[PDB]
Amino acid sequence: MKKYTCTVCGYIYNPEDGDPDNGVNPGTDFKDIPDDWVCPLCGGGKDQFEEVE
């Protein structure tokens, strides 16, 4: 599992931390995050993210 970054604000989704406050548990691969989840910092959709490396 790769990290993904919001290309609008720069937030980085790290799969080993998840986003637990919004129901995304540690270990969730980015493709498997519910498709209505948005960037915690700018509200951008998953469609604005890209793989970090």
Residue range at the interface with Fe ion (CB under 5 A); choices 12-20, 21-29, 41-49: 41-49
* Residue 8 in contact with Fe ion, rule: CB under 5 A: yes
Minimal distance, residue 8 CB to Fe ion, in Å = 5
In sequence order, what are the beta bridge partners of 5? 12, 50
Residues belonging to the chain: 53
Are the CB atoms for 33 and 22 separated by under 8 Å?
Answer: no
Residue 39 CB neighbours (<10 A) = 20
Minimal distance, residue 12 CB to Fe ion, in Å = 10
* Residue 24 in contact with Fe ion, rule: CB under 5 A: no
Annotated binding-site members for Fe cation: 6, 9, 39, 42
